[PDB]
């Protein structure tokens, strides 16, 4: 909805979304989204997400598709009215992304996910990409254990030549949307064949703000499969501006940069990160 | 409708579109929108806008969307009859944009939404870009605070991957026609996912037209997602055609220029604006 | 329809659309048209102009829609047979222009639509345009009192963030053709949202033709909203084709070109016009 | 139809396509065709060119639209089976072009059409064209006629911006049609706007076909809408290979070179052109 | 269907397609599936091609269109289903190319079809391109007289503005459908207007194919419309692709070379072609 | 569906990842894989695969296609619920590619699918690419006989202007689902055909993982028809991103080189091989 501002309130605003980064305690706000989801009527539509087709999918708060759903309204305070209503697996009415609300007054924020190595990380959509064939599926998967912490990671997989890839963009979107209302650290493995159908292209516009307003964080993995060119530089671009967190590759071997969002007109951050490969290409991420 | 004129008219519409920006009290204009719509019969539709499929949804006085409104028409002084029908939520018989006179013979105008540091602000669109990833979105928020002056700003948040960011167009829409018909200050953070389907086209082509006869001023981001090549001069070049007034970065850190569109036919104004950030990236306009 | 020529009737052609732009009297071809269309039967449809979707609305001799007409056909001299129907508002049979004779067997002229300066100007479409963001609106503002002359000239606007500036095509078009149907001497503020549309093109494509027949002149802005590079030059070909005449602005303050097309196959006269600003932009062609 | 071959029918066939150019009395094709045209029973489909939307209407002998005629069928010498069928308005069944045959085994030709200056003129399509905004209507007048001879050619005005030229594609078909079926020298005033829908493109894929066939010539002003560059060259390229015979302007004022296709598998003959202005520029073109 | 083989196998294989070429008597395979054509029960469907809009028609072998064929199927041996239905003169059920089996297990080869100049030439489909404008329609008629040595050579004429000559590409595609069904050298003159719709698509797509497996060969003319740039080099690329044979022309007059497939996998053979023109054009290929 | 890690679990995904390529007797998935197939009741939908249109067609365990198909769920560990139905020889609900789990927990390996003189081949799509018109038929033939090993390799044959060559997409699918279900080896020849319908754009996107999830490796022909500019440099870079191994001619003549990926995150291998021509051009890879 829309939200009204004058010199103070704007000024509150800001302090808590700086907050929700630098001081709240990491992984809190998705902790907070996990209990105002739990709190929903059983069979109540929580989530919509586009199809490849262009429609959307409504899943509950169970993360179980909703195939018909009598048409049902709330008035908001903003005044607006919302309307959901599900028929024959379809979204008749609504719209796309979160159908309940998990952020309320709180909006505009980067709610830390986690803290690893000296650092704070945002949830929302972290892009890592680079000069091609480097070793980014290494990096999402430490990434992922390492945001992960005391919990695991959830990993989807989606459009490689390797054995038990799905390659159906519908069940892609039917393993994001389960993802993000299960898990806190959740990992893409390939964007390659997102980037377009319109399903696929409100993915990339709807992922980071599903994730940045549940609080879990999705690490994807893209591949500049265009040349070595300059085209690295356009890709680098585009994922600057529809990620929260963008991760890209040095001259440096096993060094990357971490760019930040920290919030609606914040600071960002950059920081670097040292790698190392194990047995078995286990990737480490070096800390102190 | 169409307008006829001779010398003797011609001037008087000169002096008049003048006297709307240069010598009306500051949102007077506004203030006298708001008093027709009122006076308009409850349920009446007032506004219709485009959403993404191409069709267009309409509201009434209190924002509130029309679903069914049998066919009524009007006659126009011009002679020209207009004609509104809403069947199923959708505009059945219509236009966009206002659907009840606002402006009368008075048009091409720029009505000055309000006064700040020593200058004057016209009302209708206004685009701020320029040298990407720049603070855009700091200065929009500022501007609103100012312009805003005595009242709130409203804040329409779309297309970020920031938490509580929609990202639905349609929802987007319902926004920024309910902040118009509430509020004489608007901000629009980020139009990045608006640049194309029908009904963001619709859009760029709208909006202006739309709060200039309001008399309210929508301040809209707009980040070059484009290279930092010369693509920004193009982005610069279409936002300043649809643009009432375009505000730029400069090579001077914090320092913008204001580019305003006084009104049809008129002499288009250009002052600066000096910024400094405070606590929490919030940003403060220097006026004396 | 199709016309037949032998040496002596084409000589006699010749000198008739000669006559039609240099010696008949200024505007008499508009006031001879009009005489035609008053003697239309009541009902009878006149005009047809396509609106955005590609089909087409048709007008009665008093600019009022028809929006159901019973199939009728007439057998032309040529031998070819015309058939027009309306059907919910739109054209079911007959095609886009006037739907009635004006001109007969004098064609391919450009009727003189009036005097001023020393020069004679043509009716039909003028297209004024150059290197962007110049004063094309002032000009085509005193073009319009200029050539109206005694009377006063008609001006339709759109696409412009201005107040009161429509912004639907379809209203445009609904526009334009009463326009051509009760005035001599038209302005067109912007065909900057023309430039596309089924409807639109059918626009750029129609205009000049039915105001050369009817006799009636449209003078429309075109700012180049591209770059200012050689795009223009583009804008310009692409104008100068279209057009009946062109009016280009010079590196020369104030200073406009105008190149006119005096008819089919006739010689493409050429002459400069002088400008200055008054009090609000008031903008004056200067004559001896 | 298709047509079997040894070296000596192919000899003949040779011979005689070299005949219907070189020594046949000009205008004998023409001739031959209105006979077998008028032999032909009332309301038989004899024509059908297609519309801008890609369907086709069918013309009788009389240059008559066909609105319905049932289904029925004629089995060819080659085995091969025609069938036509109209209903509402519109081809069911069929092909585009003649539907009666006209040549028979005579194929491959470009009959003589006229003779003047000393030099043969093949029918079919010619295209004048080249660096643009010369003098191409003034000469395809004269070409028309000069070919004319002691007949007159028949005028074909289509989408320019001058008084009473049809701008509706779907007339200016059904005005070649009538052309074609009634006269052996046609003029069409712009290809400008057939440069794309599917009618359109259907029509430079068979204009030249249908003329030749009829033994009648199309005389296409062809002006290069585009820039003066090398584009011109382009246009030069696509009108050479889908004309019978080109006409083009060169570095001298007045002079124009034809280049002719005397049939299939013959030799493409080239001759110049001198002409001057009379009075109301009338173009003559200089013989002896 | 599919094939399977172990070195073995693959060695007989290769031998015969080495064979079928190389020593197997001209136009045998021709002969061979000329016998399997009339061994079909009358009315049942041997050959499937595309139609512009991307259906297909179906043919019996009689090269007479089946128009209705009730749903029938047929188990190969590779375990495969081959089902075929035809409804309202279109094929229901089925693919494109030949509905029986003419080649078996021998496959991959380009089956001599005839012998001339002390040079064996395959079946398939021959390009003949090259440098825009120089004698490619008098080449493919040589050819076709010489391949057909005893036999007299098809001609299906299509897409030039010459008389007599199809522009339908329905019509074109019942042609060669008809040509392949019952001759062994078919020519085809212009390519022209095939370079684009779905049905002009299918068929450089399947022609060559379908010919190579019937034994006949399809020699077509294909002038590059293009520029006479270095686009005649992407021309000449495309064809070698989609042709079994390619025939280009040099910088020495009269002299143009033939590039040939002999094979799957097997070695490209090239020989030079010396030719010279008799009266009306009549092309002679030199031998010895 | 989506899989939970923390660093132990993954430790373990990439030692069996890395065995299944490295250790596992070659071949042994594959033979796995059919045992899972076979134990799979008849009748139930197994594999689904998109055809032109889009749409999918589903095959059994036999490769015979299924019709129609009664709506099925089956509720997965991961709590997610998968849907098959068959209607009118159509998936009405379900998703691309295997629709029986052959893979289970280990993902993302490349399943060794053979040893040939001293190099592990992974299973998978294998795509032989390069400086065009070399020898790729002859090269996937042999990679075809000698990763056979003791069986025989299938071959799909596609897109070619020889014999018996297949030209329609949907019977292309349905040869590459029957050698996938049935073989270990198989060899594609010709994807030039491929390279765009959504049938065409799905299986670029789905064969390398179906073959991987089986245990079977495509051997595909992939032949640059573009320029041999350096568009082939793309054509390399698109296939090594959709290809498990990529196999690029040199400029060493007969030499080959080899890229294969191992497995998810897992190190790249290359090697190179040496090739010559025996009778018929059978190739022969040298080993020892
Ligand atoms: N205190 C500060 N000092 C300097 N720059 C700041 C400060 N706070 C915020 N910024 C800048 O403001 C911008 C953040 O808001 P954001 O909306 O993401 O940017 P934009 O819309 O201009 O791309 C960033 O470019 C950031 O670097
Ligand atoms: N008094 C004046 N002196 C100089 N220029 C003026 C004056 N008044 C108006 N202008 C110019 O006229 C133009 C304003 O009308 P506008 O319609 O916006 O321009 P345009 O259509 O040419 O882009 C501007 O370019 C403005 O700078
Ligand atoms: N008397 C004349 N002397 C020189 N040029 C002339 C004369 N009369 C006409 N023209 C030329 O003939 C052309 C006018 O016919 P038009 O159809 O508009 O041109 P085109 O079709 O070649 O672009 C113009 O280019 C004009 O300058
Ligand atoms: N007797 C001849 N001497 C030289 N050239 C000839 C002769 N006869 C025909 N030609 C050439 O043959 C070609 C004519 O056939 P055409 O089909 O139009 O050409 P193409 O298909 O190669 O563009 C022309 O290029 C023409 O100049
Ligand atoms: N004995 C041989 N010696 C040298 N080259 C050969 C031999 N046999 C076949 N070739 C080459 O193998 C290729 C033929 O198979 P083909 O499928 O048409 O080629 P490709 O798929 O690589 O374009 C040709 O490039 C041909 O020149
Ligand atoms: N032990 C290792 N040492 C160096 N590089 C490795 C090691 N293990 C894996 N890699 C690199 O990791 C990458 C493999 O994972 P992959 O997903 O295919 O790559 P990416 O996603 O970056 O294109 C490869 O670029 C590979 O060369
Ligand atoms: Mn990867
Ligand atoms: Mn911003
Ligand atoms: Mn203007
Ligand atoms: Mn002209
Ligand atoms: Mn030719
Ligand atoms: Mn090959």
Redesign the interface.
């Known amino acids: 909805?829309?939200?009204?501002?004058?010199?103070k309130?704007?000024?509150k605003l800001?302090?808590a979304?700086?907050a929700?980064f630098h001081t709240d305690a990491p992984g809190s706000?998705f902790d907070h989204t996990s209990g105002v989801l739990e709190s929903v009527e059983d069979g109540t539509p929580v989530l919509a997400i586009g199809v490849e087709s262009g429609d959307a999918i409504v899943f509950d708060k169970?993360?179980?598709?909703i195939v018909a759903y009598k048409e049902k309204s709330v008035k908001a305070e903003?005044?607006?009215?919302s309307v959901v209503q599900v028929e024959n697996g379809f979204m008749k009415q609504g719209?796309?992304?979160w159908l309940v609300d998990?952020?309320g007054e709180?909006?505009?924020?980067?709610?830390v996910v986690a803290e690893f190595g000296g650092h704070r990380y945002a949830?929302?959509?972290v892009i890592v990409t680079g000069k091609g064939?480097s070793?980014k599926?290494?990096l999402v998967?430490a990434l992922?254990?390492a945001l992960?912490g005391k919990?695991?990671?959830?990993?989807?997989?989606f459009?490689?030549?390797?054995?038990?890839?799905?390659?159906?963009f519908?069940?892609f979107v039917?393993?994001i949307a389960?993802?993000m209302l299960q898990?806190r650290v959740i990992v893409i493995?390939s964007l390659?064949?997102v980037i377009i159908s319109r399903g696929a292209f409100?993915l990339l516009?709807?992922?980071?703000?599903?994730?940045?307003?549940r609080?879990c964080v999705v690490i994807a993995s893209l591949?500049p499969?265009?040349?070595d060119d300059k085209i690295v530089?356009?890709v680098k671009?585009?994922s600057?501006?529809?990620?929260?967190s963008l991760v890209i590759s040095t001259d440096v071997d096993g060094e990357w940069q971490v760019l930040t969002?920290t919030?609606?007109?914040?600071?960002?951050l950059t920081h670097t990160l040292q790698t190392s490969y194990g047995?078995?290409?286990?990737?480490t991420i070096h800390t102190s």
């Open positions: 909805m829309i939200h009204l501002y004058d010199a309130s704007f000024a800001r302090a979304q700086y929700a706000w169970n993360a179980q598709r903003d005044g607006s009215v719209h796309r992304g998990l952020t709180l909006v505009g924020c980067s709610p949830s929302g959509m064939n070793g599926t290494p998967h992922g254990e992960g919990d695991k990671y959830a990993t989807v997989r459009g490689e030549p390797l054995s038990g890839y799905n390659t159906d519908n069940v039917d393993d389960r993802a898990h493995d390659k064949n409100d516009s709807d992922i980071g703000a599903m994730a940045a307003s609080g591949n499969t265009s040349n530089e356009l671009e585009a600057r501006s529809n990620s929260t969002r919030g609606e007109g914040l600071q960002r047995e078995h290409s286990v990737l």
